Amino acid sequence: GSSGSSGSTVKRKPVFVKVEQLKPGTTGHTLTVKVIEANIVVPVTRKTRPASSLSRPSQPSRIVECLIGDETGCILFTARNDQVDLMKPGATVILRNSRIDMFKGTMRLGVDKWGRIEATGAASFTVKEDNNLSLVEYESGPSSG
């Protein structure tokens, strides 16, 4: 007699995800990120893309880092010469099928080839330019060396 069975599963979440709801090892996300600032990717702090590669004439992929997120938190997301437009400062856009890149003891918001920007109307929410996720570090590890 008897069998025994358990299971509940209570995701508990809206139709869209949140910034503070992001995590490493995750992909394809759907949330509304509001751009705050948009400035070129300065050296020293945060610098990755070329990784030893300078000689052949490539295309001008104007890349600029813009601060986007929601009331929850914010994260660093790279926007191409095209996305940049959508990722303009003071503009509200959404990320569909967005993936998270596991950065050196950190992470960031990005969109894969199987993902495109939405360009929602307006945010309507006050971004929390404090609970940055592109700053906090996950799992105590190295930094540079």
Curated annotation (Swiss-Prot):
GO MF assignments: mRNA binding
User: Record's Gene Ontology CC terms?
Assistant: plasma membrane
Q: Report the Pfam families cross-referenced here.
A: Ssb-like_OB (PF21473)
Keyword list (alphabetical) reads:
Acetylation
The UniProt entry, under InterPro entries, shows: NA-bd_OB-fold (IPR012340), Ssb-like_OB (IPR048970)
Q: Does the keyword Acetylation apply?
A: yes
Instruction: List, alphabetically, the Gene3D superfamilies matched.
Output: Nucleic acid-binding proteins
Q: Which PANTHER family match?
A: OB DOMAIN-CONTAINING PROTEIN, OS05G0244600 PROTEIN
> What is the protein name stated in its UniProt record?
Uncharacterized protein At4g28440
